[PDB]
Amino acid sequence: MNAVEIISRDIYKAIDIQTKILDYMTKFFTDRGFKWLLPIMLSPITDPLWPDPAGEGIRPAEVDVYGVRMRLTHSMILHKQLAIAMGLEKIFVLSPNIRLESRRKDDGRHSYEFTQLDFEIEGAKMKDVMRLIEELIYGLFRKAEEWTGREFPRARHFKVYDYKDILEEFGSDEKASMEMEEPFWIVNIPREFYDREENGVWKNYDLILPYGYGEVSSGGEREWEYEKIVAKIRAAGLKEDSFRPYLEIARAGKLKPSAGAGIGVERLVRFIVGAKHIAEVQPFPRVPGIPAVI
């Protein structure tokens, strides 16, 4: 779409809903004693997004700052762990992510710029975080019924499936989404170095929306031990050089066990509004593979 066409759309309703969602979600966390952090957009280090069955192996956008290469935020995962290392205990941030994925990921829920409500909790287990998210989502859906007068899924807790079993039964997370009528969990997904792996089991979780809307949240317990972290990085063919300051902190023994998740705000807006494509709820669309004109 061209500039004038974009500004001509009627997205008042979507933005009204977005406002209510942000109000609800931020209060949910501050009510429970979480600290509210501001995002970082440039850093020597960022989320590799690899290995990850959900990705194609993209490289972060990079810009020089005073002669030094910085990466644009893929996600603040590493910085969340660092915030826990600073003793903040329970944190969240409204974090813009930049992920320059290909046209092949333009499936209606992807956007090359998007904001996650990203949170982390010192000492938490996967069960704790999944339960917290269920509490948030159930509460959100009840409020949405009041806001819209429409019905939303009423489940207070969601069924749990192993990634391996999803592949066997449905073939893909996307096909699973199409068949379900309530949100559900996919757990135990082999992916990035920071997700906690124990004896072949990955302590992680993705929340998937029903009716084909796809993944809305992703998280896990974390690795915190230097030796384990470095082995995982090397095994994936990644470079220690790409994580130098983070690995210095890990080597010093300053990472702590924690668990967390990120929640796609615009993906939730899309679900509540019932929009076919996420672009319909964004003032300034950022469609994968298509450089925005504004």
Ligand X SMILES: N[C@@H](CC(=O)O)C(=O)O
Residue from 77, 247, 255, 281 binding ligand X (CB under 6 A) = 77
Q: Does the annotation flag 114 for ligand binding? A: yes
| 162 sits in which H/E element | strand 159-162
Residues of span 33-62 touching its own copies by CB under 8 A: 34-45, 61-62
Residue from 32, 125, 228, 254 binding its own copies (CB under 8 A) = 254
| 127 sits in which H/E element | helix 126-148
Residues 6+ apart with CB under 8 A from 218: 54, 204, 205, 206, 207, 261, 262
Asked whether position 72 contacts its own copies by CB under 8 A, the answer is: yes
Asked whether position 220 contacts ligand X by CB under 6 A, the answer is: yes
Task: Choose between 1 and 61: whose C-beta lies nearer to ligand X.
Answer: 61
Phi then psi for 33, rounded to 5 degrees?
75, 20
The CB-nearest residue to ligand X is 262
The position carrying tokens 């949240």 is: 217
The position carrying tokens 């300053």 is: 254
Asked whether position 285 contacts ligand X by CB under 6 A, the answer is: no
**DSSP helix, strand, coil percent of the chain (3-state; round to 5):** 35, 25, 40
Amino acid at 245: P
DSSP secondary structure, 130-160, as one string: HHHHHHHHHHHHHHHHHHHS------SS-EE
Q: Does the annotation flag 197 for ligand binding? A: no
Residue from 30, 175, 225, 235 binding its own copies (CB under 8 A) = 30
Residues of span 136-195 touching ligand X by CB under 6 A: none
Q: How far apart are CA 232 and CA 252, in angstroms?
A: 18
Q: Does the annotation flag 123 for ligand binding? A: no
**Residue 261: contacted member of its own copies, ligand X, none (CB under 5 to 8 Å, by partner type):** ligand X
Task: Choose between 75 and 152: whose C-beta lies nearer to ligand X.
Answer: 75
**Residue 79: contacted member of ligand X, its own copies, none (CB under 5 to 8 Å, by partner type):** its own copies
Task: Choose between 160 and 249: whose C-beta lies nearer to its own copies.
Answer: 249
Amino acid at 199: N
Q: In degrees, to the nearest 5, what angle opens at C-alpha 34 toward C-alphas 33 and 40? A: 160
| Cβ 137 to ligand X shortest distance, Å | 16
Task: Choose between 8 and 199: whose C-beta lies nearer to its own copies.
Answer: 8
Query: Residue 16: helix, strand or coil by DSSP?
Result: helix
Site string for its own copies, 79-118 (x = CB under 8 A): x--xx-xxxx-----x-x-x-x-----------xxxx---
| 215 sits in which H/E element | strand 214-221
Beta-bridge mates of residue 98: 113
Q: Are 73 and 46 in contact (CB under 8 A)?
A: yes
Number of residues that bind its own copies (CB under 8 A): 73
Asked whether position 60 contacts ligand X by CB under 6 A, the answer is: no
Asked whether position 118 contacts ligand X by CB under 6 A, the answer is: yes
Q: Does the annotation flag 242 for ligand binding? A: no
Q: How many CB atoms lie within 10 A of CB 45?
A: 18
The two tokens of residue 177 are: 């989404």
Task: Extract the annotated binding site for AMP.
Answer: 99, 101, 110-111, 114, 116, 215-216, 264, 267
Instruction: Point out which residues bind ligand X (CB under 6 A).
Output: 47, 75, 77, 116, 118, 218-220, 260-262
Task: Extract the annotated binding site.
Answer: 52, 99, 101, 110-111, 114, 116, 215-216, 218, 264, 267
